[PDB]
Amino acid sequence: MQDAITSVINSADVQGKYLDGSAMDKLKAYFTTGALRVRAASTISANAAAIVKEAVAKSLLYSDVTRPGGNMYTTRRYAACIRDLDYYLRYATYAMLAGDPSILDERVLNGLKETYNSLGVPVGSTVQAIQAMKEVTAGLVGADAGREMGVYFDYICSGLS
């Protein structure tokens, strides 16, 4: 768990060097993008349940997975699916605020593949659900904030696949 600042400090410390001009430029880049990160995080905190339910309405609804035999069939499985998608959106917001995806592979992508493979959860359908969540939130917060959200959404989909 480290943001862009802590990773820059960790690189300069593992070097043992002081903060040179490249580290200063990286921190200036983060300190310019931080206000946009803050406003996108507020806008995403506004519409958590709406983004999640629009992602299910785009991908998972009216398909086979909500029908009998699907892994999203029962009300318990539906509630756990909404819970999993809320987790993905919340941690993508955290990784957007930090500017570093270390929290994603520390706390989402750690044992997620083995959990989903033990439960029988389809990984492709949940990857499509995360992609639709990314599409909806990029329609919500704009072009560049949607892109800096979609880089961590693509990180979650890549670590899941």
Binding site: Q2, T6, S7, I9, N10, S11, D13, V14, Q15, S22
Partner: peptide, 17 residues
């Protein structure tokens, strides 16, 4: 030019933070 050496010493790096 900044990219690959910074990656290589973020990886051999000891995370103490």
């Amino acid at each position: 030019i900044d990219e690959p050496f910074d990656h290589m010493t973020r990886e051999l790096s000891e995370v103490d933070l």
